[PDB]
Amino acid sequence: YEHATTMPSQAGISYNTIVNRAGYAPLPISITPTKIKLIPTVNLEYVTCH
Amino acid sequence: CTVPLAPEPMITFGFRSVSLKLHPKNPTYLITRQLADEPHYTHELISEPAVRN
C-alpha cells in the first residue's frame, strides 16, 4: 500500500501519523529523527603552516 | 524417475493481471489456460529469463 507523507527537517521531535485503509484497522506510524548530517564532497588542495 | 524442479516464479499482482518473472535453469514449458468457455491456452518453451504478463 503506497503511502506518501512529509516530515519537517527537525531533530528531537517525534513525528506521528496513521494509515487509514478504507475497510480495515488504522495502522499507526511513528518517526522520530535523531541526528541529521550534511556531508559535502570535500577535496583537499594544500596545507600550510609557519 | 526423478525429475528436476524449476525455480519459483515471482508473481506480481495487479488489477485483473498477473505478471510472472521466470528464471529457468534448463528449458521449461509454461502452460497457461483460462477457466472459461474460451480457454485461450498458451504452450510456450521458455529457456531464458523472461517476464510474462
Partner: protein, 49 residues
C-alpha cells in the same frame, strides 16, 4: 444456536457497495444495512462465493 437474550454473530459475503437485505431468522425478518469497502488483494486463490 440462540440463547435467551444474547446476540448472534453471522458471516456473509456480498458484491454490494451499499448492501441492504432482509435477514430471515426462523419467523421474522430483520433489516441489515451498511457500507462495504474494497478488499486488499487484487488476485486471490479461491473462486467466488
Amino acid at each position: 444456536e440462540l440463547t435467551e437474550q444474547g446476540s448472534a454473530t453471522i458471516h456473509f459475503s456480498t458484491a454490494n457497495i451499499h448492501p441492504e437485505f432482509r435477514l430471515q431468522i426462523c419467523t421474522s425478518y430483520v433489516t441489515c444495512k451498511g457500507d462495504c469497502h474494497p478488499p486488499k488483494d487484487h488476485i486471490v486463490t479461491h473462486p467466488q462465493y
